[PDB]
Amino acid sequence: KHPLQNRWALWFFKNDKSKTWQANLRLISKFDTVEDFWALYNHIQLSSNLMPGCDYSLFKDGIEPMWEDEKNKRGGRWLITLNKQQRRSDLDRFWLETLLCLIGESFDDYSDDVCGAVVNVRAKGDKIAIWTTECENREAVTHIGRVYKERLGLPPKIVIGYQSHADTATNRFVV
């Protein structure tokens, strides 16, 4: 087993409006090796086969999948916007790519600024996002944005945005 730099937690949020968000939010399991990650990924439903309104997230061990968390409070997210027609082609490969960027610590020195990632499966269009700790850190947010977009292999004409959680609750940067 090949150890990861960090221990990660995979969360699932169920769309069931006959239950509270607490009851619909589930911590599936945690892992700190490549082998344990792959074992987990291959025993859970692909993002593309989730029922509408359902979410996955991966956060560093100790960070709650909530913007009100101390590590997310003053942070934000790089948002990837996928249309209906992209789900079969892009959603799973982009979500897998995102998870590998997290566990692989692919953002060099600014990897510590990474809190986690979220995928939203919605009828109107899906979303992936990488969550960072501080939206004030311009070098960190900009470096993460550039590396992430390159790793997804998105062209220039697809402009991705970074929004602070403060603004979302109520684009600071683009690449």
């Binding site: 949020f13 968000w21 939010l25 309104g53 997210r77 979220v118 609750a169």
Partner: peptide
């Protein structure tokens, strides 16, 4: 705006 991370709008 009910989604993972922003549960205040899920009430």
């Amino acid at each position: 705006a009910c989604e993972m991370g922003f549960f205040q709008d899920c009430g």
